[PDB]
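Entry type: protein chain
Record version: 2
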Amino acid sequence: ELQLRWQEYRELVLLLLQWMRHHTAAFEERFPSSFEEIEILWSQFLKFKEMELPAKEADKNRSKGIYQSLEGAVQAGQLKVPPGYHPLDVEKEWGKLHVAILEREKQLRSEFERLEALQRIVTKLQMEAGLAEEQLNQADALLQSDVRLLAAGKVPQRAGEVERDLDKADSMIRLLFNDVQTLKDGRHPQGEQMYRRVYRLHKRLVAIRTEYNLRLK
């Protein structure tokens, strides 16, 4: 009777408290490197929020109902409620879980927006890298045509222009290294790979500027 409902109430609240703490700690704990990863985390989150949580909410509210029938024995002292087992303590922990759930949902949308931002930067960097490349190609092509004029004992015509082209590629390569550092800061998983590619264009730049300094300056 009383011993029954007391038993049922304690069994229930014990499992509820274990579950809430378990899930509260799991939320304290997981940053995605890709959309593939964030999609799984989000799915897992929604599965929890929409499938597991309401069942536990039912148990919580059922435990409250069971306790109200025990309240006469509790007040009178026949039953002592262990610390942390009162409907007040269940609600406290339920509240902390609820807060952790909202924070996690906000962190997951914030992570999705970071991933979108990183993608913008990756597109921009790839577009700029093509232009920096073309700029090094145009600088190198002018240089060889001047060198070719320096074969036929003729004077260079585009020295001024080669200088400008190199100063442009330099400016663009510097924008590229800053995009790369923005990727790295954002922990894009290939940040490092992209650094090496930009470092390569920089190497090309130094090679072309050295040749230019040797031949035309």
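Comment: The chain has two domains: 1-112, 113-217.
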